[PDB]
């Protein structure tokens, strides 16, 4: 009751659907290393950590070893398109997981405490 309005009033709906896309991909990623097991999961039990977030960003965003989608990383501008998209969606995923964190703050999760300045440093590193 306390936060749910300004939880919703935090965002434009467009951003909320972006995040409902993004951290759902995060949760599916945790289940692909079965980090949370199994067709629904509570808001109270969810694993959130800085290295979990960052390792999601690794295994999905940057780690394009991935021999089905290996080979788009050479061009001065098309890969500059690729990683501009990556740094924008990096910030978007950061906002998604920040918002998911703040969701589970009121939704009773001991496993939702983030140290966002690590993620700042990650952002600043990719920025550099």
């Amino acid at each position: 009751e306390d936060r749910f309005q300004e939880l919703v009033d935090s965002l434009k709906p467009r951003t909320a659907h972006q995040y409902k896309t993004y951290y759902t991909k995060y949760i599916q990623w945790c289940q692909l290393n079965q980090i949370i097991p199994t067709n629904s999961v509570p808001y109270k039990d969810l694993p959130i950590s800085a290295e979990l977030i960052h390792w999601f960003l690794l295994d999905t965003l940057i780690t394009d070893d991935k021999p089905g989608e290996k080979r788009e990383e050479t061009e001065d501008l098309d890969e500059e398109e690729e990683n501009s998209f990556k740094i924008a969606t990096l910030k978007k995923i950061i906002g998604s997981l920040n918002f998911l964190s703040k969701l589970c703050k009121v939704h009773e999760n001991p496993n939702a405490n983030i140290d966002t300045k690590y993620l700042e440093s990650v952002t600043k590193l990719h920025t550099h």
């Binding site: 749910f4 434009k12 709906p13 951003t15 972006q18 896309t21 289940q31 199994t38 629904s40 969810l46």
Partner: protein, 421 residues
């Protein structure tokens, strides 16, 4: 099952309110309003002709449906409604009665660019599309079905524009395709993004077309930082950029403000310009003081909602001059609390509905005291308090304005104690 034309039997006053009460979720393939999802303990954890639909139809629509990639059930359900629902007669009757009532129904049509064509679009409040019609198509069957004599219906002039719906290069091509026809007098308003003093090229492209519309009202912005740059005047009009075209500033009727923190984070919410507005509306600014504004010339309606903080016009200080009494007398001794018969007509149960004394004040220094309250307004009438929070003073509404419910408080639980003067 459902009989459509049986619903088309019973007349237009009925048929209006149904579209007024099926807002945007005309389809079944619509997502949830996300507070049910919030107020829960469950997260959604999710075929081949629909894979062919993703194969073919969807790469047109990975500009908008890509926001909805959670729950691919809704995705594979979506494109089937994207065939036949968006030509159904109920939808066309909806646009008939809507352009009859000019946005009094569900509203805000929007110039998109899909089918690589620059047609129009309808979004819901979840910004989900349903219908993509071009202006030829829209003028063809639904405008001209009811374009008998009223030439303002031969006009179509109530359509938002929404940069930040789409890419800045699509803003560029969007105004290019706007240029090739007389669609300047077709749009209704323009929206803004930023999602220091450096206006974005989307907004620059917007401003450099903005005056040529000549049929423009209803402008809304969405960023407080953007608000600072474009209409929070700050004493700046002699600028190459950053100016928002005095001629089309005259042409508008009304200004909407989506979501901010403060208006006078600067010295003032200033509108030295912007003469001919009649209605400002505050949607999700965090903090307001009332007197943070320049209070432009005559903006009669001023509605607001979703506030964190209201100060007041702090008329309470000024009422301590005209009858010159004590604050504790002003609550205890100087409230008669007459609520004669019209007060109980509406509900307004949570706010304490007070009234000053017809005995202790005696028809002089009362109408004087009422005109003190009038002095805080400068010629406005409609107030309309929705979801609100945290005034810092007493609620003070003059009885002339309070009668006929020109003020209409909708939600009141973070607040009470209206002394109606």
């Amino acid at each position: 099952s459902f009989n459509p034309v049986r619903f088309l039997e019973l007349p237009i006053d009925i048929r209006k309110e149904v579209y007024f009460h099926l807002d945007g979720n005309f389809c079944g393939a619509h997502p949830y309003p996300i507070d049910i999802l919030y107020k829960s303990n469950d997260v959604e954890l999710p075929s081949k002709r629909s894979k062919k639909l993703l194969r073919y139809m969807y790469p047109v629509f990975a500009t908008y449906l890509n926001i909805f990639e959670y729950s691919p059930q809704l995705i594979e359900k979506w494109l089937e409604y994207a065939f036949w629902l968006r030509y159904d007669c109920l939808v066309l009757d909806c646009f008939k009665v809507n352009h009859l009532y000019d946005g009094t129904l569900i509203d805000a049509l929007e110039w998109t660019y899909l089918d690589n064509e620059l047609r129009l679009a309808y979004f819901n409040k979840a910004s989900m599309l349903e219908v993509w019609y071009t202006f030829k198509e829209y003028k063809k069957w639904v405008i001209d079905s009811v374009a008998f004599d009223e030439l303002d219906l031969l006009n179509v002039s109530n359509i938002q524009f929404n940069i930040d719906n789409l890419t800045p290069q699509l803003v560029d091509k969007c105004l290019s395709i706007l240029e090739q026809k007389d669609l300047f007098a077709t749009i209704g308003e323009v929206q803004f993004g930023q999602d220091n003093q450096l206006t974005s090229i989307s907004v620059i492209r917007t401003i450099r077309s903005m005056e040529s519309m000549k049929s423009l009202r209803k402008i809304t912005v969405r960023g407080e930082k953007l608000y600072e740059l474009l209409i929070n005047f700050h004493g700046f009009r002699d600028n190459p950029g950053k100016t928002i075209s005095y001629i089309v500033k005259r042409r508008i009727n009304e200004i909407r403000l989506s979501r901010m923190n403060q208006i006078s984070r600067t010295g003032l919410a200033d509108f030295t310009r912007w003469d001919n507005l009649q209605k400002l509306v505050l949607s999700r600014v965090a903090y307001i003081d009332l007197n943070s504004i320049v209070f432009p010339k005559n903006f009669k309606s001023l509605t607001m909602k979703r506030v964190s903080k209201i100060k007041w016009w702090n008329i309470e200080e000024n009422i301590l001059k005209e009858l010159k009494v004590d604050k504790r007398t002003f609550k205890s001794l100087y409230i008669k609390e007459d609520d004669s018969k019209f007060t109980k007509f509406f509900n307004l149960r949570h706010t304490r509905i007070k009234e000053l004394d017809k005995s202790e004040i005696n028809q002089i220094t009362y109408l004087r005291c009422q005109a003190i309250v009038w002095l805080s307004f400068r010629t406005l009438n409609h107030i309309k308090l929705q979801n609100v929070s945290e005034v810092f003073n007493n609620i003070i509404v003059p009885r002339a304005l309070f009668d006929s419910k020109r003020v209409e408080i909708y939600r009141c639980e973070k607040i009470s104690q209206v002394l109606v003067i």
